[PDB]
């Protein structure tokens, strides 16, 4: 159980974004149904009144939390990968529009899943804003907790992979559009019961064997990291 509080741009807190520039759900419950419209932007997908201004090459940092800001973030049991997608705002997230900007599953050197590192990062993970057309966008951050992913939700609705999905409204002002956005995948639709990384046993299969669900990261993407960029406690 986890939610987004807000974002930072180039290491500068943009402030509490909940129901303001984040299309926040009312609580931190996971989405499990792969076929639900809730896969798009969680259970309350609607236009919220602000959109965060950024330029290509900026560092955009999602900040997650559990019950309160900068707490334990997400329960340590919730081992799994983290991805970030982008789509044009005009889509409202419908159709084949989501382009993957970032993937992190398991780090062999440190022996840590993305979620494990997100905790250590005080909930913060970033992407570098790509050189797409100026305009309004949705950035869809997705955490997949795998602690009950040995079962499929479609077969046993009390278990299943757990999706913590947050959409941020982001406006890209300065960009040369030198890497125009390509074709994306649909949510719901891209992940099915047979997709790699949706059904997995984290307890008996070595984490080095895990493969995260496709699509693969777009070649136009400019990187990201799971790492603290700002200290929330100073505010």
Ligand X SMILES: *[C@@H]1O[C@H](CO)[C@@H](O)[C@H](O)[C@H]1NC(C)=O
Ligand Y SMILES: O[C@@H]1[C@@H](O)[C@H](O)OC[C@H]1O
Q: Which spans of this chain sit near ligand X (rule: CB under 6 A)?
A: 33, 35-36, 157
Please indicate if the annotation marks 122 as binding a ligand.
Answer: no
Q: Which does 220 bind (CB under 5 to 8 A by kind): Cl ion, Cu ion, ligand Y, none?
A: none
Contact (Cβ atoms closer than 8 angstroms) between residue 169 and residue 21: yes
Binding site for ligand Y (CB under 6 A): 1, 28, 66-67, 77, 147-148, 203-204
Taking the complex as a whole, the smallest distance from the CB of residue 152 to ligand Y amounts, in Å, to 13
Please indicate if the annotation marks 162 as binding a ligand.
Answer: yes
Query: What's the per-residue H, E or C state across 44-74?
Result: CCCCCCCCEEECCCCEEEEEEECCCCCCCCC
Collapsing DSSP states into helix, strand and coil, what is residue 91?
helix
Residue 89 within binding range of Cl ion, rule CB under 5 A: no
Q: Which 26-85 residues touch Cl ion, going by CB under 5 A?
A: 31-33, 35, 50-51, 56, 68-69, 75
Residue whose C-alpha is closest to residue 190's, from 225, 221, 214, 226: 214
Taking the complex as a whole, the smallest distance from the CB of residue 73 to ligand Y amounts, in Å, to 11
Taking the complex as a whole, the smallest distance from the CB of residue 147 to ligand Y amounts, in Å, to 5
- CA distances 136 to 87, 92, 95, 205, 221, Å, are 9, 11, 17, 41, 17
Q: In whole angstroms, what is the distance from residue 105 CA to residue 103 CA?
A: 7
Please indicate if the annotation marks 128 as binding a ligand.
Answer: no
> Mask of contacts with Cu ion, 1-20, x by CB under 5 A?
x-------------------
Contact (Cβ atoms closer than 8 angstroms) between residue 225 and residue 8: no
Stretch that binds Cl ion, among 87-95, 105-113, 201-209, 219-227 (CB under 5 A): 219-227
Please indicate if the annotation marks 72 as binding a ligand.
Answer: no
Q: Which single residue brings its beta carbon nearest to ligand Y?
A: 203
Please indicate if the annotation marks 58 as binding a ligand.
Answer: yes
- Long-range (24+ apart) CB contacts under 8 A made by 154-158 are 154/34, 154/193, 157/32, 157/33
Phi then psi for 172, rounded to 5 degrees?
A: -95, 115
Q: Which does 157 bind (CB under 5 to 8 A by kind): ligand X, ligand Y, Cl ion, none?
A: ligand X
- CA distances 209 to 7, 73, 81, Å, are 32, 26, 13
Binding residue numbers: 1, 9, 47-48, 58, 67, 78, 129, 140, 147, 162, 164
Binding residue numbers for Cu(2+): 1, 78, 164
Which positions lie near Cu ion, rule CB under 5 A?
Answer: 1
């Amino acid at each position: 159980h986890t939610l987004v509080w807000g974002v930072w741009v180039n290491g500068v807190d943009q402030g509490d974004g909940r129901n303001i520039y984040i299309r926040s759900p009312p609580n931190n419950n996971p989405v499990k149904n792969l076929t639900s419209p809730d896969m798009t932007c969680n259970v309350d997908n609607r236009v919220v009144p602000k959109s965060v201004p950024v330029n290509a090459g900026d560092t955009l940092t999602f900040e997650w939390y559990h019950n309160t800001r900068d707490d334990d973030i997400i329960a340590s049991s919730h081992h799994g990968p983290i991805a970030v997608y982008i789509a044009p705002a005009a889509s409202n997230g419908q159709g084949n529009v989501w382009v993957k900007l970032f993937e992190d599953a398991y780090n062999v050197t440190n022996s840590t899943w993305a979620v494990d590192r997100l905790i250590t990062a005080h909930g913060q993970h970033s992407v570098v804003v790509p050189h797409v057309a100026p305009g309004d966008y949705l950035f869809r951050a997705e955490i997949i907790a795998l602690h009950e992913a040995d079962s499929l939700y479609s077969q046993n609705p009390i278990r299943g992979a757990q999706f913590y999905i947050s959409c941020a409204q982001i406006t890209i002002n300065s960009s040369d559009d030198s890497t125009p956005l390509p074709a994306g995948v649909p949510f719901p639709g891209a992940y099915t019961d047979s997709t790699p990384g949706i059904q997995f046993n984290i307890y008996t299969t070595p984490a080095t064997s895990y493969v995260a669900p496709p699509p693969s990261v777009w070649s136009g993407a400019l990187g990201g990291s799971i790492a603290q960029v700002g200290d929330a406690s100073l505010e």
